[PDB]
Design a binder for this molecule. Structure first.
Ligand SMILES: [Cl-]
Ligand SMILES: [Cl-]
Ligand SMILES: [Cl-]
Ligand SMILES: [Cl-]
Lengths: 200, 200
C-alpha cells in the first residue's frame, strides 16, 4: 500500500464527507468511518476518475444496502452536486419572444422519493426539482404534477410558450385567464434558470 | 301598483340582500337601495320566476355597469348560491373501483376572475373551484392549472382513475411514484364531493 494509494484514499474520505454532509449526520463517527473503510476496500473505489467517487459511494451504499430513507437522502445530496457541476450552455443576452423555444437547464433534475429527504426522512411521497439558478446557487423546490409533466415533455422536445399555451387550449375553459397565470409561471422558470433558450 | 306587486318587490329586495351579502358591504345604505330600486323598475325584475331574481340582478348590474371588481364579486356570490341549490344525483353506497368512471359534481363550478373575490378585490388573476361537499356545505378553493384541466376534461367525458393515470403515463417520468400522489388527490376529490360516480 504505497504513498499514492494512501493519498487518494484520504482524498476519497474527504470528498465523501463533503458531498454527503446531511447523510453523515444520521451516523456515528465510528459507523460513518466503517462505511468509508468498506468503500475504499471495494472495487468501485478503484476508479481512476476522482469525479466518479461520490456516485460510486452511493452505489456501494445501495448494494449494502443502507435503509431506504438514507438511500433517498444520499441520492438527493448527489443530485445537488450534479446541479452544482452541470455545464449550462452560454446564452446570448438578446430578446427571446414567446415564439422562441425553451428546453430545461441541463442543471435541472426531477426527483421522486418515498421519503422526505428535505426534512427528516418521513415516509411520504416527495416530488422535487433540483437546479442551479442565475446566481449559480443550487436550489430545490416541491414539484406539483402539472410542472413535472411540462418539464418532462419539454425535456423530450424544446417548446415555445406559444406552442405550450396553444396545445392546452383544448383541455381548458373557454375563458383564457389561465394563459396569463401560465405565462407568469413560465416567466418565473426563466428567471430562476429552470428553463433556458434552446439554441441551435 | 297593487298589493301583490308591492309584496314581490319586497321579496326581491330581501332575496338580493341575502344572496349578495359581501357585495352589499362595498356600498352605502342609500347606494345599495338605489341599485335595487333601479332593478325593480327594470324589465329584468318582471320575471314570473322568483328563482331567476339573483341572476337577473347580476345582469342588471353588468349592464349599468358596476366596477369590474364588484361584478366579479357578484358572480362569485351567485356561484355559491348555484352550488347551494344544485341537484346532485343520489349515489348508491356501494364499492366503486378505480375502474369506475367519475364525473364532476353538478354542484361544482370553475371560476376565473381578474380580481381577488375571496379577499378584497385585488387586481390579481384568481382561479377558484366552488362546490358543495358531502356535509352539504358550500366550499371554495384555489384551483391550480392541472386540476382545472382535469375537471374540465372530466366534464367533457366521464373518466376512471385507471384511464386518467394511464393517459398521463407518457407525459411523466418512468418512475411511477406520481401515480400514488395522484390517487391521493383523486381520493380527496371523492371525499370532498368534487367528483361523483358517473351512474348510467
Ligand atoms: Cl481517485
Ligand atoms: Cl425512495
Ligand atoms: Cl318574483
Ligand atoms: Cl373578472
Amino acid at each position: 500500500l504505497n504513498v499514492y494509494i494512501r493519498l487518494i484514499r484520504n482524498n476519497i474520505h474527504s470528498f465523501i464527507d463533503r458531498c454527503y454532509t446531511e447523510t453523515r449526520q444520521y451516523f456515528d463517527s465510528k459507523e460513518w468511518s466503517r462505511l468509508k473503510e468498506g468503500f475504499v476496500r471495494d472495487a468501485r473505489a478503484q476508479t481512476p476518475y476522482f469525479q466518479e467517487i461520490p456516485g460510486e459511494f452511493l452505489q456501494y451504499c445501495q448494494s449494502l444496502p443502507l435503509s431506504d430513507g438514507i438511500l433517498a437522502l444520499m441520492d438527493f445530496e448527489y443530485t445537488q452536486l450534479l446541479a452544482e457541476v452541470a455545464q449550462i450552455p452560454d446564452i446570448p443576452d438578446i430578446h427571446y419572444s414567446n415564439d422562441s423555444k425553451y428546453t430545461p437547464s441541463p442543471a435541472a433534475f426531477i426527483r421522486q422519493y418515498r421519503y422526505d429527504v428535505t426534512h427528516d426522512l418521513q415516509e411520504a411521497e416527495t416530488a422535487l426539482l433540483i437546479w442551479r439558478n442565475a446566481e449559480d446557487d443550487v436550489m430545490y423546490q416541491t414539484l406539483d404534477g402539472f410542472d413535472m409533466m411540462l418539464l418532462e415533455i419539454m425535456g423530450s422536445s424544446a417548446l415555445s410558450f406559444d406552442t405550450l399555451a396553444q396545445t392546452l387550449v383544448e383541455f381548458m375553459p373557454k375563458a383564457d385567464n389561465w394563459k396569463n397565470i401560465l405565462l407568469g409561471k413560465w416567466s418565473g422558470w426563466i428567471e430562476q434558470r429552470i428553463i433556458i433558450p434552446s439554441l441551435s
